[PDB]
């Protein structure tokens, strides 16, 4: 494919994670000119809004081969909209590691990747650091990013074991 | 010995349920009592909970703010009360109030997905 058209579902336009995720994605993808983003629209990090937007996108740009979604709720809506149109050929990519996307990936639906967050680890970290603090510790960074991992069809068994 | 308040922005979705029950469980594994306070996406309800939490003499707050601006006043009141605040998942648009603000690396994850986007679709083409 000399050109590969795709669409992007943004999260809520006013929320910074929308743009940290989108700008992270585009910092790589844009250096490959065969990828052409032919549609870009918010679906408000929401499943049912993503269905309605993807539905509009599919009747406007049927030439797309992929849809990148700022979160998994949005990828799930895009999938249900693709299946309703018969567009089972479209590859969908998400972000969060939601159980429903994980199950869709391992069962071979058209969602093929997501980004795993570790919310249990960050909730436990806040508790562990509170404990350390009440025990006397005062040396903590204020801004604490917790890392993430790519989830694919090729490593999905690491995330369902 | 002591108690922590688990102040969650909502419980209307499984993501926040997981955060809340996990923090409560971990606090109890580490020897603390813990209680979950649901703000129901309402900063007024969050503030009322902070009032109760301060009045009850809690030792630390594990905080998932309803609003990065609207919740600053509440962390400010906990600070003035002497109660440390640890933010999880959502943060506040102020520095030097919460002891720590713990969040997921969204930009890094965006970089990882862009790489696989190109690889996967370059193979399939």
Author numbering:
A (entry chain B): 16 to 176
B (entry chain A): 2 to 126
Could you give the paper's own sentences about this structure?
The PBP architecture consists of two opposing lobes, with each lobe being built of a central, five‐stranded parallel β‐sheet with five α‐helices flanking its sides. Despite diversity in the sequences of different PBPs, a shared common ancestry has been proposed a while ago (Fukami‐Kobayashi et al., 1999; Louie, 1993).
The x‐ray structure of the heterodimer closely resembles the parental protein. Finally, a closer look at the side‐chains involved in ribose binding reveals an almost identical orientation compared to the unliganded state of the native RBP, suggesting the correct formation of the preformed binding site. The results show that the halves have native‐like properties, that interdomain interactions are important in RBP and that these provide relevant stabilization, in the same way as has been described for other multidomain proteins (Brandts et al., 1989; Careaga et al., 1995; Kantaev et al., 2018; Liu et al., 2019; Vergara et al., 2023; Vogel et al., 2004; Wenk et al., 1998).
